Amino acid sequence: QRENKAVARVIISFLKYEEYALKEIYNLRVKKWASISDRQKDMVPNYTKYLANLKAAIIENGKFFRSVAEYALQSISFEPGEIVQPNDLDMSKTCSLLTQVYREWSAEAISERNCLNSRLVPFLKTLSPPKADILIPGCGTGRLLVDLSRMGYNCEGNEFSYHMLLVSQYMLNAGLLQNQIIIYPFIHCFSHWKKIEDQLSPIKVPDIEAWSSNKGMGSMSICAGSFVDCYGRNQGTKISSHYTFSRRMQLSRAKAENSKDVVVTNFFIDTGSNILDYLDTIGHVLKPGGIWCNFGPLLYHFENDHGVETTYEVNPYSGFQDKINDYTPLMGLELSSDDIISIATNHLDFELIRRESGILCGYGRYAGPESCAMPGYMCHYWILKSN
Amino acid sequence: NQRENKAVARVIISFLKYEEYALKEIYNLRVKKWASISDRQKDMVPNYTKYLANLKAAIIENGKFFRSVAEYALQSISFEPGEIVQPNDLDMSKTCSLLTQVYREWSAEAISERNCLNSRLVPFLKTLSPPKADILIPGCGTGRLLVDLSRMGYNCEGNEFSYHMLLVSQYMLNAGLLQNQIIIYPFIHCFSHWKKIEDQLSPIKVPDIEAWMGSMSICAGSFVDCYGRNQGTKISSHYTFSRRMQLSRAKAENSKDVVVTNFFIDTGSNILDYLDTIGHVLKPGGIWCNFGPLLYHFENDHGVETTYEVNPINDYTPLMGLELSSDDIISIATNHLDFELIRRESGILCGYGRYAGPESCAMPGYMCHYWILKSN
Ligand SMILES: Nc1ncnc2c1ncn2[C@@H]1O[C@H](CSCC[C@H](N)C(=O)O)[C@@H](O)[C@H]1O
Ligand SMILES: Nc1ncnc2c1ncn2[C@@H]1O[C@H](CSCC[C@H](N)C(=O)O)[C@@H](O)[C@H]1O
Ligand code: NA
């Protein structure tokens, strides 16, 4: 399937991390050291030992990605035609998974995760029914699904990146022991260091032990696909790259209507080319009286993207696609916090329940005692209730 | 010479094209996006077209600022239409970023951001440094710190190799601007992080101070080229060996009491050349003050340059590499360049052109390093 071609590319990308990282961050720095004058070499006498340590760290990270790949390979059978090589974007995504894994599965990143948990968890425990059905769009490798399902909620994550999905199935189902894996997730960042040894900091993952998903006590599932495709409205939503009209997705959207008690968007609401599709989908999938909790920045992903996609409408009489627009820009609709909440309250029958602005929180941020990494984002937080 | 003038002409043309570029880049596709969404979602954003009209108006105003800077420059430069190189998208993007730079250096709103450095540098200079001392400011941008320090009676030389910066600088320093004479809209190219979309269209008055008591001058060129060592330095893109530059470097040795690097030490492909130049240009007993992040500009650049030697060759000299930590920079300065550590602070959060309005959710800024080292 097309799914299998994508998965193959990601698995090969995992297997090739070491070679790519050596080429990308190691080789030219050996060449740079070699090219400076002996006089300048003496100013940095430990540079070559540093580069040896950086190479060792790359090899360890390669061991992690190889283990994830082998785990995926125990359950996927290809075709000769379905094995396609990864491009450079695949390799960069694989390198950034180190940051994602640090963020979602290390003890050092606990406070960064507590920005959201410290606000959402008290609210859920006191005012929302465990057990409840919670949907988590753009769930990443799925830490939040573990935390919430361990409180007894039925948690469905949604994720369209196969990089994320493959790491996710590894971290959730491989039976990892607490602190089993040592990775070096900061070695691709060469900036902001007070002490260079911090860049080579070892990080143990996962920071939590395995716990069973038990029927009737909080489960986990995942829609692999685009959010709007999996759960969108079945009428009135333009078809695009992120919205298809095949029978499968029409059925998934039909069963998705009023199916969730809670939607939690966490660094997600700003990821799309049309946030209004996201708002429509949240209102569709939530029951009356359900709550949408959002936490994260408003850093619009396509703000500088001048690409265009193709959009259509579904003809009511024929059911066929119609009203073709092949010049639909990806940029646009970069809405403010106030306008998102105002659209929800005045057009989608929501009532504002909680709101906080300017919550400084990092994303995969180095958190050591002398950290000077980029401080993070000013995050917006709100809870709206459908009615 | 000729290359210099061609470069200046091209930057001037970029200024003249700001309006057309900004319309293409941030306006047109958003009108097309509004036009393309369904009528129901259009009803979700009823003020969007009024917003786009206000955005176009702001673009017009910023274009007026850039045209004024360009014509001021055009009172001294003549160029054939055919000899001018057409600006590329990087030139236009730098021109758009000048809005942020001008906000940072010439608005009242950016005072606290400038005060991260000023609150530490000014007391140190007043208490511990000679009156009318000679101060060098590498990568000085549009030159606000030169005005601030020269107004305290210090003789200030700025150094800046970007003609975007230089042209705006000569405008802000040498034209006849009155305080608050200009209205720009410096946040309109950022569509993210807004609590209120009106904040994106905030008008900003510049300049908050009159430029026209020490003197002020500027070396237009690369820092290491203007003031580097004359022996033992590799010839590169940022180091030339013409008799001009050899001469300037000869007159540069032990010519300055203070070097102030402000968001500069991380801009080059070889920070050791920067340290060599700082140690060279400072007198014994001179002060190097540094403030800023360690965000290395070429960390992800896989390009290579060409460097060679003369008595009186490598075509694969990478730009990346030597991304040194704070501790290692200070340790190289003290242990190899005869410096003594005098002051130091790490993790000073400070913005760079940060929107500072009442409901700001703009990126918080950088975790900055600060130090004072004394040559000996
Ligand atoms: N249209 C869409 N449908 C499903 N997932 C999406 C999506 N657009 C982006 N994503 C996913 O959303 C995530 C944004 S990053 C945030 C990951 C996670 N929620 C966390 O806070 O750590 C990525 O995993 C990205 O692949
Ligand atoms: N090799 C070099 N020689 C001289 N100037 C340089 C340089 N590399 C970068 N610069 C300049 O250094 C500045 C970095 S941005 C900071 C500008 C100013 N000091 C401020 O704090 O606002 C830019 O103006 C850039 O053009
Ligand atoms: Na619903």
Curated annotation (Swiss-Prot), chain A:
Keywords: Methyltransferase, S-adenosyl-L-methionine, Transferase
GO biological process: carnosine metabolic process; methylation
Outcome recorded upon mutating residue 309 to D: In strain: SK1
Alphabetical list of InterPro entries matching this protein: CARME (IPR012901), SAM-dependent_MTases_sf (IPR029063)
Catalysis: reaction(s): carnosine + S-adenosyl-L-methionine = anserine + S-adenosyl-L-homocysteine + H(+)
Binding residues for carnosine: 270, 301, 377
EC numbers: 2.1.1.22
Domain of life: Eukaryota
UniProt name for this protein: Carnosine N-methyltransferase
